[PDB]
Amino acid sequence: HMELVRVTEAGAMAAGRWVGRGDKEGGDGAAVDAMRELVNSVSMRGVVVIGEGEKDHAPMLYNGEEVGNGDGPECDFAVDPIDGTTLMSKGMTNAISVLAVADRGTMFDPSAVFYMNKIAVGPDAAHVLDITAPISENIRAVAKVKDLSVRDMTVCILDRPRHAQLIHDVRATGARIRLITDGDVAGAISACRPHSGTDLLAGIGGTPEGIIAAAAIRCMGGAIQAQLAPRDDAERRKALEAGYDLNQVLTTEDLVSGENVFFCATGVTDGDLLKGVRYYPGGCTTHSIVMRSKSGTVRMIEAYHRLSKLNE
């Protein structure tokens, strides 16, 4: 329901007061607290599948917690109160507050392994992706299915040392790189939205971000492919002991299946799709995206919040 946008609107507005203030935990707490107060007010019966972590040293929106007013069917609840906490704390671009809802039990287990390799593309080339192939074959494939020259392709990649080869290969095909410092989820949405200046998202990031990204892709169209990415053999055992086929190419629908999927986001700082919170004498504005798998409707929502009296 469109009401869920008020959850990310509250998370963005709380985080807005911490933009640039060098306090990551201050910003997270504000957003987490505003989001939970407002989510326990929406007509919804939810369990936190993706959130701040497990119960002990994450006392709010911990994985397992119940959320919503009490009524409604039960459903999976994923929340990233600030995707890009460090971006927020330093006043840098592309921080967003993020929520996704899906049928109960239909979200992948975010704790399987911390990281996953991802590639994502918009709808027109949703069926030519292969994460097992080198990035060049994916670039060339997508550039052909989209009929563009390869020097006009843009690949969004997190700027990390572990990506030195991924970055070199993309350049060596002549395509371009949009280097982001954080925001896997925003990066995927960018690759999937019509003519955004970004054709492909590629690289290794977090397993929760990948699941949250898949929920949006289930709504706006396109495809993500993923494989788990153990950080060492210790985690690789833990992943195998738990019963994961570490060679499976996980698809959008593996990460979030289920008939009904909701995604919405609101900008914290100015970014690639959403403007961040802006302040005025009377109040503030927020910029939000809201989407739904069943209809496929996508709404862009600009909201003025008068934090004051009428007619001042």
Place this chain on the structure above:
Amino acid sequence: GSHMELVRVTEAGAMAAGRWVGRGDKEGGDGAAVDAMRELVNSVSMRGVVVIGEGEKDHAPMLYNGEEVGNGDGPECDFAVDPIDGTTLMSKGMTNAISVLAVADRGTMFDPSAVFYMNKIAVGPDAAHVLDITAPISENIRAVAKVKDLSVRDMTVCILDRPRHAQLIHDVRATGARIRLITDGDVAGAISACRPHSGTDLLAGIGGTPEGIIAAAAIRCMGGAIQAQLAPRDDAERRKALEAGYDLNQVLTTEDLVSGENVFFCATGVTDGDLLKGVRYYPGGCTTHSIVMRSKSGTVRMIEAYHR
């Protein structure tokens, strides 16, 4: 406590109205819009009565004054619908056709057929405190202009183009202000007056009483002020109103027109206007542009929807 889902009602009205723009068929557009809006309001979870609508039930089968509408009996509230504000504009492909819905606590909407027309003045939040419909239009113009920090000749006054407004136009012209004459679209006019960088600084003139009420709902949520006084047609109507309880000397404020504490208003562009883009079609679906506002919070939402 938010009810953004009511945007679906004007979104449906406008998507129906939109397959009729530019076809010369005023009633075909109205009819389709009323259809889709009736289907959709009876699927939102709040029971209300249609207080302002398509006339009454002997020759308006749908959205007639008094119809029970909505799905689950939540709280009862007033419903005012204008399936196309700008039906002629819609038929001829012209700008500023919008589809409008208003909802307020049950009983709190003024009576729409007490008198058919009422004289109006309306201005936005920044100059609402100088309004005086009993003063001449020149004094409102100069007062509004001073507050707004504009010369009188920078001012732009929106007036309906009707024979009845010949003296009003003369007196507005005599002051030095510009005029924006509209053929119809009384609601969108008043909303323009209350938006900042819109081009309309003031709305004035005699329009319909339902449109005045719908306008007041909007203003309740976004800020500003409209003042009105009933303007009976002839001698029968002036009797009908005096022996109804109304002081004809009375200035009606926004809150007299819509007095509820919970007012909601939304509108969706049919054709391109100075506030909302019109519905645009392409193969996969269409896009609508809407405004949704709530008086309790004072929150105003611009909603651009891509339907698939």
Place this chain on the structure above:
Amino acid sequence: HMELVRVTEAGAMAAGRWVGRGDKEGGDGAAVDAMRELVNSVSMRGVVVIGEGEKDHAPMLYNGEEVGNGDGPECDFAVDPIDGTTLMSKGMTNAISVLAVADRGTMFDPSAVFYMNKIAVGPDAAHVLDITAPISENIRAVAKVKDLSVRDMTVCILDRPRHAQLIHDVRATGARIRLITDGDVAGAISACRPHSGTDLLAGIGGTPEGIIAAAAIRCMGGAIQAQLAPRDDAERRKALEAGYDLNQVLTTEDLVSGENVFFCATGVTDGDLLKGVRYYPGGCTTHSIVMRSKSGTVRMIEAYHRLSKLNE
């Protein structure tokens, strides 16, 4: 040169003060006077080919007059200080102030006959037009070359009694009609601009408006076809005696030939492409289009004019 936009900017700003004020001549004089003062200041050597009329009871920008600072090659000069004077006087939409420049002698004679039948289309169907055929065959042709359904075609037509059959035919094909009360020139630009919601302009209007429309079409792309339209047999003699082949289908390049063509316009009231003049405490804004045949570059220009002191 982009400097020419200041001519239409001045014409719009002068007319702005007459919007809605019920005085057609007041508005025309203001615009005519502001345009001429500013055109005699641009690096240009011009002769007024299309203007306010002949020398006697049109004392400013009369057909024949010299314009510009004195320097430069000589060139044809067309000016419509307010296209839609009645729209301006009543505060109605779509009034614009209009200027076109072309090689000297390369503009059609605007006095041949008062009126002309016109049809105009954007570039993608610029080669399937035929003004001699019924409107239906032109609609269907354009709808096929554009691959759209015919019920999705929109035809812009002046609302005049002399168009009762043109309007009936367009409806009878199921296409839509954008009924305008004035603004031939704006209507053509609308039909020729990419995705404007207007596919075709059709009908009889003024010969100067048709020539001014062709100058823009020489710049932004597309096609106009025209034939002169005598209002009676008296004018038909005058047109024949002067040596016109009243059956010629005049083309864009017949109306304005010449290697170099300039067009620009600025909104007076709010319209289909340009916003009208808007007033603020410090000043005003104008909205303008400027285009050039040789480059094909089209510029949209928003200008804030501070009619005051700096930093107030």
Place this chain on the structure above:
Amino acid sequence: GSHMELVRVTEAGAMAAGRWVGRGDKEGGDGAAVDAMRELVNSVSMRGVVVIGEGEKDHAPMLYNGEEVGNGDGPECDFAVDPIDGTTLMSKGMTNAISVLAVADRGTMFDPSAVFYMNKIAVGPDAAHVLDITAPISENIRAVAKVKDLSVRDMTVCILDRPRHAQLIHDVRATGARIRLITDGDVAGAISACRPHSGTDLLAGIGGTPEGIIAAAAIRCMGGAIQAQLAPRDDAERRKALEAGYDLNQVLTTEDLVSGENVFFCATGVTDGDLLKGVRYYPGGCTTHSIVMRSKSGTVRMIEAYHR
């Protein structure tokens, strides 16, 4: 007296810079931008000298400090070019790369290598009258906020992300304001400060002296104020400036930085920024987004160009 044709210089810079965004090649983008800008300025009809440019002529072949540029010797004027403000941002595909040109009466531009860095503060027209670079940053914040009618915690202060600004950041944070840290882009930062609904209420910190001069040109035309004081690196430079004629205690105003009566400034988006969209390509050509302003008239033009 208008010279809108100078937009072609940054339009060419940005169209060259744009075929390099997202390629990791900072110098390949710079080089292409300098190329096209040199070609184009030597084809506009006003002779000037490059006063601010790509360094000096032994290892900057083009746009070196002192180069005669322009076509026909009109009046002689000062030329300041920044072919890409945001070269690193351009190489990495990030926002806010712009291509910049500034021109003023000959001799009226401050000397760019008197000192390399200068401390800066800048704000827009509405609060320019409270600026005081000699006061602490907290007092400017609260003063600017009062004028702007904002709480201190609504304020947003743009600061370069450099080790040298650790105390500045601490003192800005200590007041309650938000910060917008930028990695580079000193010019675009200051222009943001002077635009209304931009998100940046104040710019502060030590940046380069050329960028400060280019910024003052902009401000001369659009309104607002920048204040600066020279900030010599070490002991050699502080001598170089004292025995050059400069009072180190001196507050420099906008007009001290650019003193001409005729200043022009234009900029074109390279990548998307908070003021200008970046160059976008398609098959037939491309589109650029530019700002052109002139101090004599105070006219500001947003120019969206479709090149074929």
